[PDB]
Design a protein around this ligand. Structure first.
Ligand SMILES: [Mg+2]
Ligand SMILES: [Zn+2]
Length: 462
RNA sequence: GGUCUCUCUCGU
RNA sequence: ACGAGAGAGA
């Protein structure tokens, strides 16, 4: 992706969008109990911790565009993927506004605890002023779909969250593009059923992990991904995508039966406008972070990308022997013969993608189940039942979370959640965690899950 | 102060 | 089941 122009809001007539500049994060009662080196992300240009210009840092992610149209490797990649999806028989028909707005069995309702985006957010209009759980009223929606129409600009906010110290120094906070509720509704109406299908079928047919539950999914992945594992990280995946990958997406949609009216919406997320503070700017390429379908479209593109890269980098690739699961930019994949990602990465650079060794390795090494990660979790076979696989969230990470809170009122829930993640690392690590938590007065006041009970409940899931 | 998923807690 | 809240992941 790449910024095409920047204009002041006076010149575009777009309402200023301002977001909070102070973090909700505060050190917790456990801050000094556990070691960690993340802090709240820079939210403001005059952050003492800065070492670079904030705004230049923020937008440096739009590295530019290389390809704009599909070459023949990408076309072939598209069609191989699209043919694979066909067996799922996605209903290409349009979802009703009621279901799009209020949800189904395989699609959660539009989040009403969350901004309504442009222009409501600057008009003081929240989602709850237009939508109602109990009424399932769509009447007000319709009136506004007409009043403000579609393709409204995304509202740019900085993400309040913990970042590594190096990232706080270098101003590399992350950005979210709040979608207008109008575009969310319409995108959900156009692709709601695809959403449903993908949520219901995490695995190697969708080539997507959206909808998975790591507690149980982790045991299938070595059966779903037979043979030689490969994986790698992307730097700035979303923003790095060139318009060709959106053309590529269009070809997949067409091939599985979407109308041209439907397919035409892809260009409306390849080419987007955004309001950050007092300015309007244009982005060509780049997945808009907070559009409806972000995770699914990113996963789908990632499936195209991996196929294209394989058949361009190597001779004799049989795409049918590829297995992969993506979650956005995150990937785990397998092939009957080991795939050298150094080479894939070289090819990826010609496509505008920056690919790095899995897990901040210094160089491209072998990926095996013993060191693979996915959704930040490792893979650790249970000692008693080796076919049952623990997702292992590293205690290091968990230590980062517990050292802060956005509201110490919810400490109990927060700690319990961490424990639910922690225990997979085993008894000795888990009790080490627990007794460190007990080492502090609030800690002794918390209900902490018993290990054996966690384990026993885990086994019973199978 | 986005899009989503998963899980937990608390209600009725 | 419906509501509310949280945590984590992408
Ligand atoms: Mg990964
Ligand atoms: Zn534009």
């Amino acid at each position: 992706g790449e910024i095409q122009w920047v204009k002041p809001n006076k010149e575009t007539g777009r309402l200023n969008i301002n977001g909070p500049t102070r973090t909700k994060l505060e050190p917790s009662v456990f801050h000094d109990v556990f070691e960690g080196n993340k802090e709240p992300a820079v939210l403001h240009s005059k952050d003492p911790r800065l070492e670079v210009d904030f705004e230049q840092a923020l937008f440096s992610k739009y590295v530019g565009n290389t390809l704009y149209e599909p070459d023949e490797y990408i076309k072939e990649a598209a069609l191989h993927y699209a043919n694979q999806l066909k067996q799922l028989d996605i209903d290409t028909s349009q979802m009703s506004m009621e279901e799009a707005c209020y949800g189904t069995e395989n699609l959660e309702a539009i989040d009403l605890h969350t901004s309504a985006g442009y222009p409501y957010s600057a008009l003081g209009i929240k989602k709850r002023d237009i939508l109602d759980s109990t009424t399932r009223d769509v009447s007000k929606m319709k009136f506004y779909m007409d009043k403000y129409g579609l393709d409204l600009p995304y509202s740019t906010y900085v993400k309040d969250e913990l970042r590594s110290i190096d990232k706080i120094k270098k101003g590399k906070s992350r950005l979210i593009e709040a979608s207008s509720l109008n575009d969310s509704v319409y995108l959900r109406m156009t692709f709601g059923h695809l959403y449903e299908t993908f949520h219901a079928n995490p695995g190697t047919v969708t080539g997507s992990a959206v909808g998975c539950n790591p507690d149980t999914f982790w045991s299938k992945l070595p059966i779903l991904l037979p043979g030689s594992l490969f994986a790698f990280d992307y730097s700035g995946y979303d923003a790095s995508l060139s318009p060709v990958w959106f053309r590529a997406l269009e070809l997949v949609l067409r091939e599985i039966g979407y109308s041209e009216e439907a397919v035409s919406l892809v260009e409306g997320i390849n080419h987007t406008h955004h309001v950050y503070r007092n300015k309007t700017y244009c982005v060509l390429g780049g997945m808009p972070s907070g559009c409806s379908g972000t995770s699914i479209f990113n996963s789908m593109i990632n499936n195209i990308i991996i196929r294209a890269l394989l058949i361009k980098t190597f001779k004799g690739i049989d795409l049918d022997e590829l297995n992969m699961v993506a979650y956005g930019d995150d990937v785990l994949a397998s092939y009957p013969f080991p795939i050298d990602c150094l080479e894939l990465a070289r090819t990826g650079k010609e496509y505008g993608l920056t690919m790095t060794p899995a897990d901040k390795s210094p160089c491209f090494n072998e990926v095996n189940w013993d060191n693979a990660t996915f959704l930040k979790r490792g893979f650790l076979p249970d000692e008693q039942f080796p076919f049952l696989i623990h997702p292992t969230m590293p205690m290091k990470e968990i230590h980062e979370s517990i050292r802060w809170t956005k509201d110490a009122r919810n400490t109990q829930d927060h700690v319990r959640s961490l424990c639910l993640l922690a225990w997979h690392n085993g008894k000795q690590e888990y009790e080490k965690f627990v007794s460190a938590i007990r080492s502090v007065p609030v800690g002794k006041a918390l209900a902490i899950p018993n290990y054996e009970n966690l384990r026993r409940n885990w086994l019973e899931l199978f």
